[PDB]
Amino acid sequence: PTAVCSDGTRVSNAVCCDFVSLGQDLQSMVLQGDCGEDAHEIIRLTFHDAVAISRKLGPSAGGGADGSMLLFPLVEPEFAASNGIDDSVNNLIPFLSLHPTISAGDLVQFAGAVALSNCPGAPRVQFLAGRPNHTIAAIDGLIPEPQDNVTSILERFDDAGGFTPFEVVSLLASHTIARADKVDPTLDAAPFDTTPFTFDSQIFLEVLLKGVGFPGLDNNTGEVSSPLPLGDTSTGGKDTGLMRLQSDFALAHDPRTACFWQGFVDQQEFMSQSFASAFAKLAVLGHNTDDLIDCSEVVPVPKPAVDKPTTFPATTGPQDLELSCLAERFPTLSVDPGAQETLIPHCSDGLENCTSVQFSGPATDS
Numbered sequence: 001p002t003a004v005c006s007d008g009t010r011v012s013n014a015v016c017c018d019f020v021s022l023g024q025d026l027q028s029m030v031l032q033g034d035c036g037e038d039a040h041e042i043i044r045l046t047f048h049d050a051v052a053i054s055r056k057l058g059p060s061a062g063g064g065a066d067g068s069m070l071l072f073p074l075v076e077p078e079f080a081a082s083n084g085i086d087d088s089v090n091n092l093i094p095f096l097s098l099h100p101t102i103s104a105g106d107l108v109q110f111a112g113a114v115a116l117s118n119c120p121g122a123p124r125v126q127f128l129a130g131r132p133n134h135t136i137a138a139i140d141g142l143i144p145e146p147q148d149n150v151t152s153i154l155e156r157f158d159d160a161g162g163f164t165p166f167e168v169v170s171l172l173a174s175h176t177i178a179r180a181d182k183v184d185p186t187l188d189a190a191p192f193d194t195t196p197f198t199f200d201s202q203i204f205l206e207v208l209l210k211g212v213g214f215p216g217l218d219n220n221t222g223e224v225s226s227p228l229p230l231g232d233t234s235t236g237g238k239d240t241g242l243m244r245l246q247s248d249f250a251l252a253h254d255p256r257t258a259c260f261w262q263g264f265v266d267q268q269e270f271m272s273q274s275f276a277s278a279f280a281k282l283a284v285l286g287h288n289t290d291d292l293i294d295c296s297e298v299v300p301v302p303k304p305a306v307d308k309p310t311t312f313p314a315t316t317g318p319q320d321l322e323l324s325c326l327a328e329r330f331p332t333l334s335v336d337p338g339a340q341e342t343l344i345p346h347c348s349d350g351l352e353n354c355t356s357v358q359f360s361g362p363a364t365d366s
């Protein structure tokens with residue numbers, strides 16, 4: 001039967017109401033209403049938790065979106081491909097005992113949905129509940145890495161859950177709110193687009209610009225040249241320059257994926273809806289949805305998309321594009337004014353001094 005939660009929310013199932021206080025605690029204790037570092041980490045964790053599953057190897061290889069990262073924090077978070085995932089894992093573990101009726105698998109996915117809701121332009125994703133509260137650790141080798149080629153990436157996603165090339169590119173819209181701490185050992189929080197606190201299509205445009213240098217070292221595995229490498233970290237600042245992943249570059253230019261990649265440029269609603277659909281599929285890997293219950297109503301309404309059009313960042317323009325898609329013309333867009341690169345802020349408030357919640361815990365890094 002239907003019910004009304006303590007916050008006034010109408011749900012199709014009263015068990016959904018347990019998630020209301022969980023969302024409140026996730027915000028008050030970790031996410032702080034922001035599309036910031038901790039939100040980004042948790043969204044990355046939804047993927048590392050979910051994708052560790054394989055049709056061809058069978059169920060013993062991993063249970064998908066099963067909370068295995070939280071329940072066995074000494075195993076998967078320390079595999080090489082998950083270096084750095086410990087921060088999100090250690091931030092979520094305490095919620096398992098604070099909200100003991102909610103499984104680790106549900107916790108990971110619900111935290112991701114709440115985190116996304118803090119990001120202007122992000123979709124309000126589906127949330128199904130009821131993932132069982134026990135599993136085993138996945139094997140190593142199931143998480144794509146940034147040095148991987150497109151054939152490998154596409155095969156891994158197909159084997160994980162039958163994702164199509166379009167769905168893979170759609171999921172990578174998440175790199176619109178993403179930075180790197182481990183790719184370059186000399187850099188912290190190197191952003192993948194110029195708006196890492198905004199769920200927009202800048203990532204799609206900016207990967208298509210010609211690379212001109214590196215924000216740090218020039219020879220890191222999985223990294224390629226960036227179109228906007230300038231930061232202020234050489235003078236002690238925290239506004240790290242923009243980083244480009246080899247995998248994002250490869251997706252942007254491969255015949256299977258390049259038109260899907262370009263098709264999101266300046267198509268905010270199409271991008272966000274496409275991400276939402278593929279992400280809902282990711283979130284239930286390892287489960288038959290018939291065995292889950294719809295608790296989508298308890299995902300917070302996301303911050304609205306920003307008013308700002310999609311534009312070329314200062315000092316760039318259409319002459320800098322490297323295009324690969326014949327099927328669709330790249331749209332005419334304005335160029336942000338300015339003679340030098342604009343520093344990409346380290347914080348959603350535009351400053352450099354913001355700090356993030358980090359709980360101690362059992363997962364480790366490097």
Ligand code: HEM
Nearest residue numbers: 040041043044047144145146171174178179180181182183
């Ligand atoms: C081919 C598939 C993918 C590859 C190779 C990849 C690679 C990476 C790498 C190397 C980083 C930086 C980690 C670090 O050094 O700190 C990163 C960050 C991130 N990834 Fe991906 N990723 C992929 C797919 C996805 C998907 C499917 C999602 C979610 C739907 C996702 C969400 C994120 C987020 C939110 C971050 C930022 C984390 C932070 O700023 O703390 N990624 N990814």
Ligand SMILES: [Ca+2]
Nearest residue numbers: 049064066068
């Ligand atoms: Ca898992």
Ligand SMILES: [Ca+2]
Nearest residue numbers: 176195198200
């Ligand atoms: Ca962005």
Ligand code: NA
Nearest residue numbers: 041179180181
């Ligand atoms: Na990070």
